[PDB]
Design a protein around this nucleic acid. Structure first.
Ligand code: MN
Ligand code: MN
Length: 445
DNA sequence: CATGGC
DNA sequence: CATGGC
């Protein structure tokens, strides 16, 4: 990684260690996903390795009315993880010392003399491929503690930074943890929750990489194992190399991407590999159980874990319901577009996820872009998703959704492979035709 | 009113 | 997925 980001991380490692000398308690503010949670856990474990104290708040968004609330708190150091860049002037106003470890699209109005931004964008690194908020926090706290490098990668996983290998600083952090002896890389089958589920559920719940026929299908995987010589109820670590060699051979036919890198730290032995941990933190976040999530990053392991594993389990049962619905009621196709639609509240928060899983499983044609639609009374939340072939071929959902949404006083955007929009329900039909007419110009002439 | 989710 | 509107 470029020297500047290790310099700037060291600049922020100074500000911390000197407040911990004085006995100051540190304020941590972070985001509520796996990257946010794992980021907070990083700073918290650096802080506990030096007998410091801290006060964590976990929020979904950062609002101005919270940074104003923050300024009468009388804390000497504010450590923002996975949020800040957007609201830099308002955090510059804040008294005392400040650290923003974020990886979002920063403010060119780049404020703060008391403030220490770390953000991989400002060191010509990629903010959605090469380093995560949890990763950036480890750069901020490398000099104090190096045992936290696993959590750094957990955030990177949850936040989808893995194409054929961790790029950039994540690779660097991955390298570094291996040398430290806290992380182990291995090539193995990438099955969901191996230590903790029987083989057939583990194959059923492997949503990424998708397993056509098997993913989200207990009876089929159960079937699949039975008729290939393998005990559907035994745990994956309890197989023998020749039956391991059989499942590997067959699962590789169904999708070769299932064999590849798997990361394990001795702190998470019994729970999961770093992907499974990410999953668990995401489930805690999505149930507003932030103390359970943080608990886990700090080693807490009794009933908290069992609660956390059950949140994962429940969420996975949603996604099967989920892909089972998709499936019963297919997508209605049109010109350069698919779309599916629900008024069921059960699917409002899951729609994008099942949308893109359903393309990986080939249920719905991966070449045609897919618009998940969820009715929120007078508005319709839109989750757009397509394949890598569909982009390298014109399709850009990032712009198209912004164009068409703003047309009807609504609001959309993103990338590229994946966009979101909020649109009036009265307009939905004309909106769906306008995206279709916009994609047609994006691929045709 | 206030906050806190997506 | 852009939020910052609901
Ligand atoms: Mn993040
Ligand atoms: Mn985040």
């Amino acid at each position: 990684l470029p020297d500047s980001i290790l310099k700037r991380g060291a600049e922020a490692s100074k500000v911390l260690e000197e407040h911990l000398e004085r006995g100051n308690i540190i304020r941590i503010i972070s985001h509520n996903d796996a990257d946010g949670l794992s980021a907070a856990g990083v700073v918290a474990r650096a802080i506990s390795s030096m007998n410091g104290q801290f006060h964590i708040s976990i929020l979904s968004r950062l609002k101005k009315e919270f940074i104003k609330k923050l300024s009468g708190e009388k804390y000497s150091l504010f450590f923002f993880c996975d949020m800040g860049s957007a609201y830099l002037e308002e955090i510059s106003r804040l008294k005392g010392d400040v650290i923003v470890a974020d990886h979002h699209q920063p403010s060119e109005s780049e404020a703060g003399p008391h403030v220490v931004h770390i953000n991989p964008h400002l060191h010509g690194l990629d903010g959605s491929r090469d380093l995560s908020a949890s990763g950036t926090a480890y750069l901020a706290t490398r000099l104090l503690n190096r045992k936290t490098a696993p959590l750094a990668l957990v955030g990177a996983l949850g936040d989808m930074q893995y194409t054929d290998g961790f790029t950039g600083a994540n690779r660097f952090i991955m390298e570094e943890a291996v040398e430290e002896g806290v992380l182990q890389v291995h090539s193995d089958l990438k099955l969901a929750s191996r230590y903790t589920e029987p083989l057939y559920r583990s194959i059923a719940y492997t949503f990424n990489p998708a397993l056509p026929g098997l993913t989200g299908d207990m009876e089929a995987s159960m079937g699949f194992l039975e008729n290939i010589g393998v005990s559907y109820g035994v745990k994956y670590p309890d197989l023998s190399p020749e039956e391991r060699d059989v499942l590997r051979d067959e699962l590789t036919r169904i999708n070769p991407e299932i064999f590849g890198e798997v990361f394990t730290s001795r702190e998470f032995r019994n729970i999961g590999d770093l992907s499974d941990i990410a999953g668990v933190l995401d489930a805690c976040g999505k149930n507003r159980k932030y103390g359970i999530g943080i608990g886990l990053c700090l080693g807490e392991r009794e009933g908290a874990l069992d609660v956390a594993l059950e949140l994962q389990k429940n969420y996975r049962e949603e996604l099967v319901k989920g892909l089972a619905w998709i499936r019963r009621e297919g997508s209605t196709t049109l010109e350069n577009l698919q779309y599916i639609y629900s008024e069921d509240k059960a699917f409002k928060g899951i729609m994008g996820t099942i949308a893109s899983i359903s393309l990986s499983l080939k249920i719905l044609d991966p070449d045609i872009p897919l618009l998940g639609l969820s009715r929120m009374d007078q508005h319709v939340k839109v989750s757009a998703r397509t394949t890598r072939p569909a982009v390298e071929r014109g399709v850009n959902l990032g712009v198209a959704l912004r164009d068409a949404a703003a047309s009807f006083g609504g609001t959309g955007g993103g990338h590229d492979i994946a966009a979101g929009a909020m649109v009036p329900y009265r307009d939905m039909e004309s909106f769906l035709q306008l995206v279709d007419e916009i994609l047609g110009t994006q691929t045709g002439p």
